[PDB]
């Protein structure tokens, strides 16, 4: 997930809202970040209807095998790449599809 264009590391929630607005409040614009409130969790920050929504991605364990989920284990993924790739085609609990990635700035 670290080698993906949509992953921004350990940026803040407001940092995520500033980047999305800087690129344009388009439906489907998203990024994934490491959560600062939960060091073990991640967040899918998604723009929908010109509002940035945040979806907590939590780690869990089932018999020595770790998975990530946004719905308490109803839908499970091995890594964040599988979660993003799935929701680029299927809405799930999201209000829209992951359409455009919020890119990291070119330093």
């Amino acid at each position: 997930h670290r080698t993906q264009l949509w992953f921004h590391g350990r940026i803040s929630r407001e940092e995520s809202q500033r980047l999305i607005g800087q690129q344009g409040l388009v439906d489907g614009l998203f990024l994934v970040r490491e959560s600062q409130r939960n060091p073990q969790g991640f967040v899918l920050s998604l723009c929908h209807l010109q509002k940035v929504k945040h979806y907590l991605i939590l780690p869990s364990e089932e018999e020595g095998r770790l998975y990530f989920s946004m719905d308490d284990g109803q839908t499970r993924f091995t890594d964040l790449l599988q979660l993003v790739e799935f929701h680029q085609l299927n809405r799930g609990i999201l209000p829209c599809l992951l359409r455009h990635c919020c890119t990291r700035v070119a330093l």
Binding site: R37, K53, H54, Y55, I93
Partner: peptide, 8 residues
């Protein structure tokens, strides 16, 4: 649901 987050 998780406080602070739009999960449902």
């Amino acid at each position: 649901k998780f406080e602070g987050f739009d999960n449902e």
